[PDB]
Amino acid sequence: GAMGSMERASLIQKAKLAEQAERYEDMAAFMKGAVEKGEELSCEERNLLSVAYKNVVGGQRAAWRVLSSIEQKSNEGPEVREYREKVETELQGVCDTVLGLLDSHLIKEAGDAESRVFYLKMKGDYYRYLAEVATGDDKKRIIDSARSAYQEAMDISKKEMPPTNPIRLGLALNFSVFHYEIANSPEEAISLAKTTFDEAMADLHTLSEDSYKDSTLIMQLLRDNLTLWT
């Protein structure tokens, strides 16, 4: 890659500068380069990677939704479809890049429970983003891949992490979204969200000093979804 000549530490440093400058594409490129050095990522580095690529794909998803809505309205000239397909192709390229990094470099048998859960959650997420724009035979493969990644992350989190852990909570939130929005399973979405919230409250004493703000934020977002869904 184009980051091959740069020291790992310089790449991390530049990802942080890019974050500060809100240059999320640059940030994602710097972190891709850091990952490709083939060393494990710390918590702080996983956050950089996550933030960078979520910003990039988030912008593409929001654009895609705008174009898709215009397209659907005009089916009640080829230009709307063509531009939607262009944005879609770019979005898929970004998801494929992330899934490639996860598969080539980041997902392992060893390491932290946290790290393993986090990367499998990320795999679930970027398959879900592919599923939002998918149509045919490709789609059922994609949905199955998301569920599989999420379900494995869930099994590990439930055995190895407290119920208030932010990765555990964030994973459960995103899986419930999957169930509701992608898998068309509102009952499973609701049950997971409810169970996740109630078990965190029941073991509220497990909140960590260094992450309790994150935990409580996700608990509120679980409650917001539950209110929207019932």
Binding site: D125, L173, D214, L221, D224
Partner: peptide
Amino acid sequence: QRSTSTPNVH
């Protein structure tokens, strides 16, 4: 309205 997923922080 869309379901809310995990946001970006820190």
